[PDB]
Design an enzyme around this catalytic site. Structure first.
Site, short mmCIF file in Angstrom:
data_model
loop_
_atom_site.label_atom_id
_atom_site.label_comp_id
_atom_site.label_asym_id
_atom_site.label_seq_id
_atom_site.Cartn_x
_atom_site.Cartn_y
_atom_site.Cartn_z
N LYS A 50 0.44 -0.76 0.07
CA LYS A 50 0.08 -0.17 -0.10
C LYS A 50 0.75 1.20 0.02
O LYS A 50 0.70 2.16 -0.56
CB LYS A 50 -1.04 -0.16 0.88
CG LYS A 50 -2.01 -1.04 1.22
CD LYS A 50 -3.29 -1.34 2.09
CE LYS A 50 -2.15 -1.38 3.39
NZ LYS A 50 -1.21 -2.79 2.96
N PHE A 91 12.78 -5.69 2.58
CA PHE A 91 14.18 -6.29 3.10
C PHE A 91 12.98 -7.01 4.69
O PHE A 91 13.85 -8.00 4.58
CB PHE A 91 14.95 -5.52 3.71
CG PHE A 91 15.79 -5.56 4.75
CD1 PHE A 91 16.82 -7.04 4.73
CD2 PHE A 91 15.94 -4.93 5.65
CE1 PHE A 91 18.20 -7.70 5.51
CE2 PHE A 91 16.89 -5.40 6.87
CZ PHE A 91 17.66 -6.45 6.75
N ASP A 96 11.44 -12.16 6.65
CA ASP A 96 10.40 -12.10 7.80
C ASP A 96 9.05 -13.83 7.36
O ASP A 96 9.30 -14.30 8.01
CB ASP A 96 9.73 -11.31 7.88
CG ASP A 96 10.03 -10.53 9.21
OD1 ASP A 96 10.64 -10.72 9.49
OD2 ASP A 96 9.60 -9.60 9.87
N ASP A 100 9.19 -17.62 9.48
CA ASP A 100 8.33 -17.69 9.81
C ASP A 100 7.47 -18.38 8.81
O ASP A 100 6.69 -19.41 8.97
CB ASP A 100 6.83 -16.88 10.66
CG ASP A 100 6.80 -15.13 9.72
OD1 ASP A 100 6.68 -15.98 8.23
OD2 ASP A 100 6.45 -14.92 9.40
N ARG A 105 2.43 -13.29 0.44
CA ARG A 105 2.45 -12.11 0.66
C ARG A 105 1.89 -11.62 -0.47
O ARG A 105 2.26 -11.26 -1.16
CB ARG A 105 3.76 -12.19 0.93
CG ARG A 105 4.42 -10.40 1.06
CD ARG A 105 4.15 -10.18 2.27
NE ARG A 105 4.62 -9.78 3.72
CZ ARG A 105 4.81 -9.71 4.34
NH1 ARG A 105 4.49 -8.69 4.32
NH2 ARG A 105 5.10 -10.78 5.24
N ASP A 167 10.39 -11.64 19.46
CA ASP A 167 9.13 -12.03 18.83
C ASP A 167 9.17 -13.33 19.02
O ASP A 167 8.47 -14.01 19.57
CB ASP A 167 9.06 -11.44 17.89
CG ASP A 167 7.47 -11.34 17.26
OD1 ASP A 167 6.27 -11.82 17.95
OD2 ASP A 167 6.93 -11.92 16.45
N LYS A 193 9.71 -3.82 16.68
CA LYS A 193 9.70 -4.51 16.39
C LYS A 193 8.40 -3.57 14.61
O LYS A 193 8.76 -3.84 13.35
CB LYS A 193 9.01 -5.58 15.80
CG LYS A 193 9.11 -7.12 14.93
CD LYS A 193 7.76 -7.91 14.77
CE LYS A 193 8.14 -8.65 13.85
NZ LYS A 193 6.30 -9.71 13.47
N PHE A 232 -2.25 1.10 16.23
CA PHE A 232 -1.96 0.73 14.97
C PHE A 232 -2.19 -1.32 15.52
O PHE A 232 -2.33 -1.46 14.42
CB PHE A 232 -1.17 1.18 14.17
CG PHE A 232 -0.84 0.24 12.34
CD1 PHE A 232 -1.55 0.54 11.87
CD2 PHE A 232 0.31 -0.56 12.58
CE1 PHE A 232 -1.83 -0.38 10.51
CE2 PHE A 232 0.29 -0.95 11.55
CZ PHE A 232 -0.45 -0.96 10.64
N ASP A 236 -4.75 -3.44 14.14
CA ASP A 236 -4.48 -4.89 13.49
C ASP A 236 -4.84 -6.21 13.63
O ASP A 236 -5.58 -6.24 13.21
CB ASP A 236 -2.77 -4.38 13.07
CG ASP A 236 -2.52 -5.42 12.31
OD1 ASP A 236 -2.96 -5.60 10.45
OD2 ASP A 236 -2.08 -6.61 12.62
N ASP A 237 -4.54 -6.10 15.35
CA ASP A 237 -4.98 -7.70 16.01
C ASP A 237 -6.05 -7.54 16.14
O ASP A 237 -6.67 -8.82 15.73
CB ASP A 237 -3.66 -7.73 17.31
CG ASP A 237 -2.25 -7.99 17.12
OD1 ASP A 237 -1.99 -7.58 15.94
OD2 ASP A 237 -2.28 -7.43 18.34
O1 LIG Z 1 0.46 -19.87 8.58
C1 LIG Z 1 1.23 -19.38 7.47
O2 LIG Z 1 1.86 -18.87 7.65
C2 LIG Z 1 0.32 -20.45 6.10
C3 LIG Z 1 -0.63 -19.14 5.75
C4 LIG Z 1 -0.66 -18.25 4.70
C5 LIG Z 1 0.10 -17.62 4.31
O3 LIG Z 1 1.25 -17.72 4.49
O4 LIG Z 1 -0.33 -16.95 3.70
N1 LIG Z 1 -1.65 -18.37 4.85
C6 LIG Z 1 -2.74 -18.89 5.30
C7 LIG Z 1 -4.52 -19.09 5.74
CL1 LIG Z 1 -4.93 -17.82 4.59
C8 LIG Z 1 -4.44 -19.47 6.96
C9 LIG Z 1 -3.77 -20.44 7.13
CL2 LIG Z 1 -5.01 -21.99 8.68
C10 LIG Z 1 -3.02 -21.09 7.06
C11 LIG Z 1 -1.68 -19.77 6.11
O1 LIG Z 2 0.07 -0.54 5.25
C1 LIG Z 2 0.22 -1.43 6.01
O2 LIG Z 2 1.43 -2.49 6.41
C2 LIG Z 2 -0.86 -1.10 7.39
C3 LIG Z 2 -1.60 -0.04 7.61
C4 LIG Z 2 -2.36 0.41 6.82
C5 LIG Z 2 -3.31 -0.19 7.16
O3 LIG Z 2 -3.61 -1.40 6.75
O4 LIG Z 2 -4.94 0.10 6.79
N1 LIG Z 2 -2.47 2.34 7.71
C6 LIG Z 2 -1.26 2.35 7.51
C7 LIG Z 2 -1.27 3.41 8.02
CL1 LIG Z 2 -2.38 4.96 7.85
C8 LIG Z 2 0.32 4.50 8.04
C9 LIG Z 2 1.21 3.14 8.43
CL2 LIG Z 2 2.72 3.59 8.79
C10 LIG Z 2 1.40 1.65 7.75
C11 LIG Z 2 -1.01 1.40 7.84
#
Ligand SMILES: O=C(O)Cc1c(C(=O)O)[nH]c2c(Cl)cc(Cl)cc12
Ligand SMILES: O=C(O)Cc1c(C(=O)O)[nH]c2c(Cl)cc(Cl)cc12
Ligand SMILES: O=C(O)Cc1c(C(=O)O)[nH]c2c(Cl)cc(Cl)cc12
Ligand SMILES: O=C(O)Cc1c(C(=O)O)[nH]c2c(Cl)cc(Cl)cc12
Lengths: 343, 343
Positions: A50, A91, A96, A100, A105, A167, A193, A232, A236-237
């Site tokens: 974004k 990066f 990351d 993990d 992505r 983390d 982080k 934020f 997000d969580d």
């Molecule tokens: O968990 C992960 O790291 C792998 C993973 C990804 C992903 O990597 O995009 N996306 C997932 C979704 Cl939508 C559902 C579940 Cl049950 C596992 C994953």
């Molecule tokens: O872009 C992202 O990783 C998440 C994200 C969202 C969003 O998810 O709407 N919005 C953001 C804003 Cl306003 C500022 C910054 Cl510094 C990060 C974000």
């Protein structure tokens, strides 16, 4: 808003960025093949998100610098520094996703998951980091804030890495020891982080480019920005689970990933010995049947209402911080970002 | 020699290095657990090698700076910068051992191969890199060569990474396409991946600390040093196979690793269509029976004699370079290093 309109000039500047980076090979055709690989790494990983952090640099730069000192040259540097932030971002994401074992992505397959890449992505990730400093040198070597930006990017990388270590120690791949999922640990992970490079870095970069190198001004901006960053991540969580996938554009996987989410931290504070046991046997499982059980436990603890309460208290606290620490900076710089974060 | 005696004061300085790096947690106990992990990463990976590159910085510093400006403070900085070089080294080794799936390093198990580490080593590697800049800031922030050292360390990292990309493209894990194992590709990999950070970086760092920031002086030193670096790697490749494990302290695995060795590059230049086929069916195999076959093909092509001839021509060329480009620097700086490399 100010982002949607400025976003065009930003994304389009990428072409020059890539060109300038993959043009040192003109004097050294010997590394041409490596430079081609670098170009592919850039196009795949620095594009597709974004661009919020990079745009923040551009947006903040215009609000901190007088319209007369905004010559084409100064704006080009602002765009470049904004892209340096995106490169730092790229990066971290590439590295990351390997650590993990992610699969996708930004909708697409993780760079390291592409055939012929694999662990080579570790070096690709390092090259992304290096491009940051190549760009700063090429565009800001003569500027008086040159050293300040280098140090800022370096410190931001260190903080992020230190936060990543934390983390990794908190949620070891496999170990579901919920004992370390404390509020103080959660806030500390978010600060290092995510908050520093996501919310402090961008405005700080703009500040230095605007000539605002005051150590006190940066401490005040940081005071405000780290608080915004914490909200934020907490939001997000929350949205990760109770969010609408069609609006957020993403599916929640925090519970399945045994993440040290804000929700799980709150659940652990508001839970009976029996409720705890329920979480231990359902947290970090792929089975949707188990996931739904955790979500069920959250609602029962009224976390969605707890988050709602925290969001209002958080907003008030941010406005107070802005009203108290914004000056001599334009409150808009912070208000604009805040409005964007709070839904 | 000058290394064996100075090595003591160097290795012993590590304790202060580790202390200074893991002491910022005093003001932020929140990241204590991360700092403990960082300390473990440092002790395991920055210790155990020969410290040749770091020592070169110390050694070169004493020969480039007048005995009166060698106060305890200046020497402490010299030791620190020498350790920064070792940290850069540790950063590359940890990441490289993961990328090529190595099992051991410096006699011990590869960091990432330790239980509980694994891919987390990618972040550990990044922290090693970051420590470099933390140390430079802490010890050289006020020095007039501060920015020069930062840029030098950054450029060295980029070159090494660009060289790593080249090497990864040249010998893809699996593909034994001997077509890309050309002399020009081999020299280019050595230059970027090894020579710059191993032989130019250390003296360049000392040069900047001594106040020798001339762009011409650095180009001349680099001219000499990259040639020394190229011979070093060519000799290392030769000894990897025809070397004595009891004297070298290591067993050859280049052939088994399908490495773009200098030997294989020479063999490809001096081979008949049939000899080529022999190499294609034995290069990159674990079977000692196949390895011995390759070694057999090398001797028959008189490579050991070719290397001997190259070593003498190489030495002459280095002395000419020194006699021509050393000044205004003390020839000893280069002669000392050369003597050390040429057996
Ligand atoms: O968990 C992960 O790291 C792998 C993973 C990804 C992903 O990597 O995009 N996306 C997932 C979704 Cl939508 C559902 C579940 Cl049950 C596992 C994953
Ligand atoms: O872009 C992202 O990783 C998440 C994200 C969202 C969003 O998810 O709407 N919005 C953001 C804003 Cl306003 C500022 C910054 Cl510094 C990060 C974000
Ligand atoms: O330390 C190493 O990695 C290899 C190595 C050896 C050696 O193996 O004897 N000797 C070296 C010298 Cl004199 C200078 C530099 Cl810069 C590197 C080395
Ligand atoms: O080749 C590798 O990367 C693994 C490896 C290592 C090592 O990693 O230390 N050492 C080896 C030796 Cl001595 C012989 C053979 Cl046949 C393979 C290996």
């Amino acid at each position: 808003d100010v982002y949607a309109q400025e976003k065009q000039d930003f994304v389009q500047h990428f072409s020059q960025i890539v060109r300038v980076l993959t043009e040192d090979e003109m004097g050294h055709p010997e590394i041409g093949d490596a430079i081609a690989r670098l170009k592919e790494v850039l196009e795949y990983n620095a594009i597709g998100g974004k661009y919020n952090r990079g745009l923040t640099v551009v947006v903040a730069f215009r609000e901190l610098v007088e319209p007369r000192k905004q010559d084409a040259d100064s704006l080009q540097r602002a765009w470049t520094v904004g892209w340096c932030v995106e490169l730092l971002q790229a990066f971290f994401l590439v590295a990351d996703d390997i650590m993990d074992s992610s699969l996708t992505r930004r909708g697409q397959i993780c760079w390291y998951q592409k055939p012929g890449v694999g662990l080579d992505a570790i070096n690709d990730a390092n090259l992304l980091e290096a491009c940051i400093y190549r760009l700063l040198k090429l565009y800001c070597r003569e500027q008086p804030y040159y050293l300040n930006l280098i140090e800022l990017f370096l410190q931001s990388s260190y903080q992020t890495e230190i936060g990543q270590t934390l983390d990794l120690l908190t949620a070891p791949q496999g170990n579901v020891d919920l004992v370390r999922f404390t509020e103080k640990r959660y806030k500390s992970i978010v600060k290092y982080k995510t908050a520093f490079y996501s919310f402090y870095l961008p405005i700080a970069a703009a500040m230095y480019m605007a000539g605002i190198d005051g150590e006190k001004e940066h401490a005040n901006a940081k005071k405000i920005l780290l608080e915004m960053g914490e909200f934020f991540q907490i939001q997000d969580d929350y949205l990760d689970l109770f969010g609408d996938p069609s609006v957020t554009g993403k599916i929640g996987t925090d519970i399945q990933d045994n993440k040290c989410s804000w929700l799980v931290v709150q659940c652990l504070q508001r839970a009976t010995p029996e409720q705890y046991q329920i979480l231990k046997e359902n947290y970090g499982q792929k089975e949707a049947e188990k996931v739904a059980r955790v979500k069920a436990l959250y609602e029962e603890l009224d976390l969605p209402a707890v988050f709602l309460q925290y969001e209002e208290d958080s907003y008030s606290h941010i406005m107070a911080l802005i009203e108290q620490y914004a000056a001599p900076l334009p409150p808009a710089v912070f208000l604009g970002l805040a409005r964007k974060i709070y839904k």
